[PDB]
Design an enzyme around this catalytic site. Structure first.
Site, PDB file in Angstrom:
ATOM      1  N   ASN A 102       0.809  -1.207   0.000  1.00  0.00           N
ATOM      2  CA  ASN A 102       0.000   0.000   0.000  1.00  0.00           C
ATOM      3  C   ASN A 102       0.835   1.247   0.000  1.00  0.00           C
ATOM      4  O   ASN A 102       2.113   1.162   0.103  1.00  0.00           O
ATOM      5  CB  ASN A 102      -1.075  -0.002   1.127  1.00  0.00           C
ATOM      6  N   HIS A 126      -0.296  -3.051   7.179  1.00  0.00           N
ATOM      7  CA  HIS A 126      -0.570  -3.854   5.959  1.00  0.00           C
ATOM      8  C   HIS A 126      -1.512  -4.996   6.342  1.00  0.00           C
ATOM      9  O   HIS A 126      -1.322  -5.636   7.381  1.00  0.00           O
ATOM     10  CB  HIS A 126       0.763  -4.440   5.378  1.00  0.00           C
TER      11      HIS A 126
END
Length: 165
Positions: A102, A126
């Site tokens: 991400n 995450h």
């Protein structure tokens, strides 16, 4: 009711290496598991078949899933360009954990990483959603093509992928 299983057939400069298969934790992170399952089958018209692992760091992780820009700047989800962090129930416990890459809070797309070590500093940042089932020997073989900066010395590709059963 049974968590789904998906496979990747891996190649190195076009030459077949072996198969890696994954359990997806649909019981705990159904939205995130479903995205990875559908990108593996290609059933929405786009997905992982033919894409590469663009960043591999021995003693850390193997990262891929960027099927739009091939370099770690792209990808998209089955829900739109990005989607939210579903939950952080599962932790980065050791080799073989499957987790979303991400670019900040609530920015999941299609990029993912497979851990080759415990990465506890990523806990709560995450989303963990599966683990390697079979083929961790194949992941260790892939890892030998990486480097300290993550550039690979041969091209590491998902030659085929899909769902098992």
């Amino acid at each position: 009711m049974v968590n789904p299983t998906v496979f990747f057939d891996i190649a190195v400069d076009g030459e077949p290496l072996g198969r890696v298969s994954f359990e997806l934790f649909a019981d705990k992170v159904p939205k995130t598991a479903e995205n990875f399952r559908a990108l593996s089958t290609g059933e929405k018209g786009f997905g992982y078949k033919g894409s590469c692992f663009h960043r591999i760091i021995p003693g850390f992780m193997c990262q891929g899933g960027d099927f739009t820009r091939h370099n770690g700047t792209g990808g998209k989800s089955i829900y739109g360009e990005k989607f939210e962090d579903e939950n952080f129930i599962l932790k980065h416990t050791g080799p073989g954990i499957l987790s979303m890459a991400n670019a900040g809070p609530n920015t999941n797309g299609s990029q993912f990483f497979i851990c080759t070590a415990k990465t506890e500093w990523l806990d709560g940042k995450h989303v963990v959603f599966g683990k390697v089932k079979e083929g961790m020997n194949i992941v260790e073989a892939m890892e030998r093509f990486g480097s300290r900066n993550g550039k690979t010395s041969k091209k590491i590709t998902i030659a085929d992928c899909g769902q098992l059963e």
